Design a protein around this nucleic acid. Structure first.
Lengths: 193, 96, 173, 50, 52, 72, 145, 140, 241, 124, 104
RNA sequence: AUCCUUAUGCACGGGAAAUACGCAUAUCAGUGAGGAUUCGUCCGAGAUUGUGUUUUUGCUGGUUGAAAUUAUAAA
């Protein structure tokens, strides 16, 4: 579909260009909406702002391929190079759809501790990320154990968030031990939680 | 190709190992990237190849289990999918 | 940094400053005394005598920057403006204690000497403090930090709402 | 002494498609700008640009 | 193991705005300026005096 | 004054002789040991009086210790 | 990378010979689009219809007009006498594919394929690159496969 | 190692060792000389001991030769190690469940050091329990 | 005083193993013959066990069987070392018996190249001129590629930082950098030596060559230029990918 | 006592002067230490004057330099102390040969010339 | 050489234009802090870098800004712009000198 | 007596850097360290080893919290 569609939309683009020429115009990238995130390379290429520089980036695919010998951490996308090709996939739709599948945001939240945070709506919030947190406290004279603990930490948040559905009958079966002084029953030594 | 499938499997396994320290989220992200790589690049080919499909099934399961293990020594009956598939931004892991 | 005095100038300003993304629009905890622009005399006059939208320019540090530091100058301005805000007339009087100490044709403040300037500043400070005392019933002894806060910001102050206080207490116990 | 990533080597262009939610805020802002009397003109222009 | 002198903060016209150990730093702006400028002069004067 | 490391020491005697014209020898070791380490200073500590305010001058004692300038 | 490519060009030329490589290219003033040529006739000249290379992996597509293939097979036999027919065994297929629809190792076809690969091997020197039978995969299309 | 680590002859000796390290932590290895697992542990600890030196100390106990300390583990008696500070027993919660003693081989020298470090820290704090940085839950 | 001696001998044992791993001889002088022999024997035994063990581990990994999370890592080190040994041994062998291309072969293949070139009628790629038309752009491209790696990461190690700094310098004093590059191309026949960390694509590994950050810039430039230049002149046939 | 073949040996004051000159040259980069460097200088022609160490043992390792000087008409001395010479050069390690090199635009040209003259006087 | 007794001292407490800079190099920046915050609901903004698309800017980019386009207000700092080592600097200087010589 | 050069020492002042900066009963080192090269030659001063700190030494200040708290005495 992508290759046939590429064939199509490039022809279309060419036609458009010809038309523009006939009517003396630079080709309006406003018109190419519809056939924008299609084609290989994408029509998003042609009107990227670094077009004329990337003209000289040649033997680029092969260079990318040969990164398996230069940079160590190894590349799950050696094949395409965003610049010269474009977003060769989209998965934005996917994120949207997954939420829907799990009864929308609200439903998802109702799994999580969220309502415990006691906000009216969710519009105004933000998370502090885990990687960021790790980074922040990895500028200190920390003995390896400490570092490990820090690394672990970004779970001791995730777990808590998902607590109220990692800590019920159906998820884990067994005891129901009372966390001391509190009406909070575990369903297992989910130690972080 | 068999070889590519094998490579994919290895990648999954790699992700799974070196997890002890590594966060659930990071691991999940890695998995996503690997799976995205697999899919975006072959696309058509996966739906035919049954072995690859099987691997994907199992790989995903393994990934889920790592998280489960982290959460509790005892394996659960089952989580909801929620924790795994909910997006990073709603506090999930964002497995694709 | 476009620092803004009012809290909610950010959004509209931000919108109008996408074209200059280098620029970073900062709110502030300081109740800065630029609301006392109209307490200044020449400026006020110019505002009055506009028949139209008029972009108008002033070295609000008139004869200052060759004599004292930029920061120093700004501090002085803050002191004076604050005083003006508190009670304009008093400030004016202070400025115009000596009629020999005139205001030039292109300035907005009474071209003093350095000792004189210092004295004026002191007077202004006194006015600020005394006025504050009169207003919000407080002993003028305080701490130097507190005094500084009062002058610079006239800020909200660490004013924990009753609820907050209660929460804190709970946490403590 | 893993050092900090030189701030100005942060990632810049060819980003993901802008989020509907995000866009809506902008739209709202522009509506406010417009509806709070016309500029007269530039508000409309700004909206168009957006 | 002495406290025979004391060590103060070496202000300048670039510090000026950032030192708070000595008082009056925004309180009495021009007084503060005088103090800091004066201090600087003394330092310079001291150097010159030493040379002399 | 001496620039190019003044003069050498075969047994130090030569150096001493050289110094002789300058003529000021043993005072500057009663300073140099106080600086080159402060062990002498430490010993001394384990004091010193100025012409203070209201000396009288019947009063005659002044110690020093780092939490406080203890006057007797 | 560039160096590697250049080196492989030498090897490519050897594989293709000067003449066939040239044909594949087209002329210098007006080069060809990958896999195309100018004429149907220059396509149908040498065996080597398409050729390509992606790094180490080369991909030569040969054609043969029955008789030619037979001749090649005969030559191969002469060089390497194959009485016991240890040739469908000792060969590679795409063990991925079904049983049914991989290279039917139909003796003659197998022989042809092996002959072709032998020829290819002969074409390039050893000392630049070991081209091994193990590593090669020589699908044959025919009346059979 | 045999030559690297110091070994104990009798229960009294062991007790003395446990008591008399005020500053350092004390890892004893209770194990039968000729066993695989025990040997491995000793090898690991040989490496670690020098490293951790200024904070911990490693010792060895032939459990068959010195049978005084079958109070410690109710006669389970696999080839274990135990952690001590100010003559208090120090409790290192892994997954395993045996919070008392690590009755299992760890292979990452660094990992071993880290756990020792953790326990030292715990001891200094005054804590009896300490959660290991690592999990385990494989090597029972 | 035997304990001390034993301890010493332990170190010797360790050190010969280390040497073997490195791939350096254990030509210790004052050691007595039979002890030395014993040590050698031990080392041999280790090798027999060690290499084989590594291979087994690798096989297991390939299978996807079950293997300890540190064991695999260990194997990868050991395996890497073995690979290195093999490669350097290969090199040594080559050195011993001359270049595997005999002259006739060379003549054949060189001739093939030359004739091809003639057929294609190829203007050779000239040295990057002192005032090259597409110089600056090329340089920029090179630097971008170098950067690429970091664009993600939030911390940097030291080497990485150094590299980044170099890149910045190149950007910021472009002319100077260009000059340096040119000089290197002209002259520099010698180089800071290259360390080879090994990869992890488990089912088959190797090799990541870490060149010194400075040389890298020059190399990058060269890569950019040749690939550009070749493309401009059609050195590479339509077929090559 | 110093070697006979080390000739011309300076006198004390002269020696001191020479060392001062050396020091000056060292600061101004107008000197080269070391037998081999001295030799190089001589070959070039850049040597204004050569300073050797009498207390070089084994003296032989210098005693080409004098010959070279003679054949190039560069004046030369030995000083007595190789340690001293080394120090002057700016080297803790003890040195045997140095060369004050030529350069018209030296501040210390005049001083150097004086020393050269002195050296010449010694020679005969 | 042994590891040091792990004690947990907090003695330092320093600050000072002079000392800030140094430490500014190691501190996370303000834009990095911003990045580390991710808006809650939204599909939060990612830069697809060819080597790895993974990277989320995060709440560095302002809502409105995000909706439109990029920012150089978040190219803020001079106090962590990767400077060379002593060695590296020296090497570069040497190279420059060589180049100059060649040019003559 | 006036002006300048070099080195140093003391300092004002202005900067950059600390991934740097030391130390050594060590081994070697202008009687050649380590490097260049157009291959003719050229530069000429540390190197090796061990090791102590090294997201930093010493000091100050604030806000805070911490919970931050008020002498005796006669009718």
């Amino acid at each position: 579909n992508e290759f046939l569609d590429s064939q199509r939309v490039w022809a279309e683009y060419a036609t458009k260009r010809q038309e523009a020429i006939q009517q003396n115009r630079r080709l309006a990238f406003e018109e190419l909406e519809g056939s924008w995130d299609r084609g290989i390379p994408r029509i998003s290429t042609l009107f990227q702002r670094d077009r004329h520089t990337l003209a000289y980036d040649r033997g680029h695919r092969i260079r990318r391929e040969f990164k398996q010998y230069s940079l160590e951490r190894n590349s799950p996308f050696w094949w395409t190079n965003s610049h010269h090709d474009g977003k060769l996939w989209n998965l934005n739709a996917y994120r949207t759809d997954v939420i829907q599948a799990l009864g929308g945001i609200e439903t998802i939240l109702e799994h999580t501790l969220f309502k415990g945070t006691g906000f009216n709506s969710w519009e105004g919030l933000f998370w502090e990320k885990a990687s960021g947190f790790e980074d922040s406290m990895q500028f200190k004279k920390l003995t390896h154990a400490q570092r490990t603990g820090l690394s672990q930490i970004p779970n001791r948040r995730f777990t808590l968030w998902w607590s109220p559905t990692i800590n019920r009958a159906n998820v884990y079966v067994g005891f129901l031990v009372q966390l001391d002084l509190t009406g909070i029953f575990l369903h297992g030594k989910i130690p972080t939680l | 190709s068999e070889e590519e499938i094998k490579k994919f499997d290895s990648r999954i396994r790699g992700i799974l190992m070196a997890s002890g320290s590594t966060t659930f989220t990071k691991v999940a992200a890695k998995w996503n990237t690997s799976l995205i790589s697999l899919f975006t690049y072959f696309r058509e080919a996966i739906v035919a190849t049954e072995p690859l499909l099987d691997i994907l099934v199992k790989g995903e399961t393994r990934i889920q289990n790592r998280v489960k293990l982290g959460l509790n020594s005892k394996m659960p009956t089952r989580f909801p999918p929620a924790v795994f598939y909910t997006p990073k931004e709603l506090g999930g892991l964002g497995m694709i | 940094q476009i620092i803004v005095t009012r809290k909610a100038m950010l959004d509209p300003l931000e919108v109008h400053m996408l074209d200059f993304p280098n620029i970073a629009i900062r709110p502030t905890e300081l109740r800065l005394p630029f609301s006392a622009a109209m307490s200044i005399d020449k400026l006020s006059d110019v505002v009055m005598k506009a028949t139209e939208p008029q972009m108008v320019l002033f070295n609000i540090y008139d004869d200052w920057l060759d004599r004292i530091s930029s920061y120093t100058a700004f501090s002085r301005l803050t002191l004076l403006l604050r005083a003006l805000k508190t009670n304009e007339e008093s400030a004016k009087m202070i400025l115009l204690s000596d009629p020999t100490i005139t205001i030039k044709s292109y300035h907005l403040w009474p071209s003093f000497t350095d000792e004189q300037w210092i004295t004026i500043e002191s007077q202004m400070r006194d006015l600020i403090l005394t006025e504050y005392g009169r207003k919000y019933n407080v002993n003028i002894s305080a701490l130097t930090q507190t005094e500084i806060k009062d002058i610079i910001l006239g800020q909200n102050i660490k004013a924990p709402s009753v609820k907050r206080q209660k929460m804190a207490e709970l946490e403590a116990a | 002494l893993s050092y900090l990533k030189d701030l100005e080597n942060d990632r810049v262009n060819s980003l993901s498609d802008a989020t509907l939610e995000d866009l809506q805020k902008m739209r709202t802002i522009l509506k406010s700008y417009r509806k709070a009397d016309p500029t007269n003109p530039q508000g409309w222009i700004a909206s168009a640009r957006l | 193991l002495g406290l025979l002198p004391k060590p103060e903060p070496k202000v300048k016209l670039s510090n000026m705005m950032s030192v708070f150990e000595n008082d009056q730093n925004i309180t009495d702006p021009t007084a503060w300026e005088k103090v800091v400028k004066d201090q600087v002069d003394l330092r310079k004067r001291k150097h010159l005096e030493e040379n002399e | 004054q001496y620039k190019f490391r003044e003069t050498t020491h075969s047994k130090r005697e030569l150096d001493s002789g050289d110094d002789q014209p300058q003529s000021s020898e043993a005072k500057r070791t009663k300073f140099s040991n106080p600086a080159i380490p402060p062990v002498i200073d430490l010993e001394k500590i384990k004091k010193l009086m100025t012409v203070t305010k209201v000396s009288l001058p019947e009063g005659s004692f002044k110690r020093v210790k780092p939490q406080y300038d203890e006057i007797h | 990378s560039f160096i590697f490519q250049y080196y492989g060009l030498v090897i490519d030329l050897l594989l293709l010979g000067q003449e066939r490589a040239t044909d594949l290219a087209g002329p210098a003033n007006n080069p060809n689009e990958f896999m195309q040529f100018k004429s149907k006739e220059v396509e149908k000249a040498h065996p080597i219809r398409l050729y390509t290379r992606y790094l180490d992996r080369i991909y030569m597509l040969f054609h043969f007009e029955e008789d030619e293939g037979e001749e090649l097979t005969d030559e191969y036999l002469a060089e390497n006498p194959d009485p016991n027919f240890e040739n469908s065994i000792g060969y590679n297929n795409r063990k991925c594919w079904p049983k049914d629809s991989r290279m039917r190792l139909i003796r003659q076809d197998v022989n042809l394929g092996r002959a072709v690969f032998w020829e290819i091997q002969s074409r390039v020197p050893t000392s630049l690159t070991s081209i091994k039978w193990e590593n090669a995969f020589v699908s044959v299309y025919s009346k059979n496969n | 190692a045999s030559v690297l680590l110091p070994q104990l002859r009798t229960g009294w000796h062991v007790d003395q060792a446990i008591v008399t390290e005020t500053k350092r932590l004390v890892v004893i290895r209770f194990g039968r000389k000729n066993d695989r697992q025990c040997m491995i542990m000793d090898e690991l600890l040989s490496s670690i001991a020098e490293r951790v030196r200024n904070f911990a100390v490693i010792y060895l106990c032939d459990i068959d030769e010195v049978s005084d300390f079958d109070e410690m583990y109710e006669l389970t008696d696999p080839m274990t190690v135990m952690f001590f500070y100010h003559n208090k027993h120090m409790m290192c919660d892994f997954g395993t469940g045996n919070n008392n003693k690590l009755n299992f081989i760890v292979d990452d020298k660094q990992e071993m050091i880290d756990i020792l470090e953790t326990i030292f820290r715990g001891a200094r704090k005054n804590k009896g329990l300490v959660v290991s940085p690592y999990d385990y839950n494989h090597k029972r | 005083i035997r304990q001390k001696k034993a301890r010493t001998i332990l170190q010797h044992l360790s050190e010969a193993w280390r040497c073997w791993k490195a791939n350096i001889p254990w030509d210790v002088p004052g050691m007595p013959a039979p002890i030395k022999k014993i040590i050698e024997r031990y080392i041999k035994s280790k090798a027999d066990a060690w290499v084989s063990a590594a291979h087994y581990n690798r096989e297991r990994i390939k299978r996807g069987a079950h293997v300890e999370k540190t064991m695999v890592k260990k194997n990868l080190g050991r395996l890497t070392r073995l690979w290195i040994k093999n490669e350097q041994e290969r090199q040594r062998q080559i050195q011993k018996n001359g270049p595997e291309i005999t002259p006739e072969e060379a003549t054949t293949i060189f001739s093939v190249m030359v004739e091809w070139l003639e057929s294609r009628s190829f203007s050779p790629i000239p040295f990057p001129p002192l005032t090259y038309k597409n110089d600056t752009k090329i340089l920029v491209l090179a630097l971008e590629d170098l950067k690429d790696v970091y664009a993600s990461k939030v911390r940097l190690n030291a080497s990485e930082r150094e590299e980044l700094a170099l890149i910045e310098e190149a950007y910021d004093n472009p002319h100077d950098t260009l000059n340096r590059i040119k000089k290197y191309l002209l002259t520099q026949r010698v180089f800071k030596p290259v360390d080879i960390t090994m990869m992890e694509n488990y089912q088959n590994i190797s090799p990541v060559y870490s060149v010194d950050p400075l040389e890298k810039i020059t190399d990058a430039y060269l890569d950019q230029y040749l690939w550009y230049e070749a493309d401009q002149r059609k050195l590479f046939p339509n077929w090559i990918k | 006592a110093p070697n006979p073949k080390a000739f011309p040996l300076a006198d004390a004051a002269l020696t001191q002067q020479i060392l001062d000159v050396v020091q000056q040259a060292a600061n101004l980069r107008q000197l080269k230490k070391g037998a081999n460097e001295a030799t190089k200088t001589l070959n070039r022609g850049i040597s204004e004057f050569i300073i050797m160490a009498a207390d070089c043992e084994p003296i032989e390792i210098l005693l080409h330099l004098p010959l070279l000087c003679e054949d190039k008409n560069v004046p030369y001395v030995f000083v007595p102390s190789r340690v001293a010479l080394g120090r002057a050069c700016g080297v803790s390690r003890p040195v045997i040969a140095a060369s004050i090199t030529t350069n018209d635009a030296s501040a210390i040209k005049t001083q150097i010339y004086a020393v050269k003259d002195k050296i010449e006087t010694l020679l005969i | 050489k042994a590891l040091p007794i792990p004690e947990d001292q907090p003695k330092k407490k320093r600050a000072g234009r002079k000392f800030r800079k140094y430490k500014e190099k190691f501190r996370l920046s303000h834009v990095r802090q911003l990045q580390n915050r991710m808006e809650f609901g939204k599909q939060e903004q990612t830069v697809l870098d060819s080597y790895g698309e993974e990277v989320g800017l995060g709440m560095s980019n302002t809502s409105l800004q995000q909706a439109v386009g990029a920012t150089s207000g978040s190219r803020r700092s001079a106090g962590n712009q990767a400077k060379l080592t002593k060695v590296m600097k020296h090497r570069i200087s040497e190279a420059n000198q060589q180049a100059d010589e060649f040019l003559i």
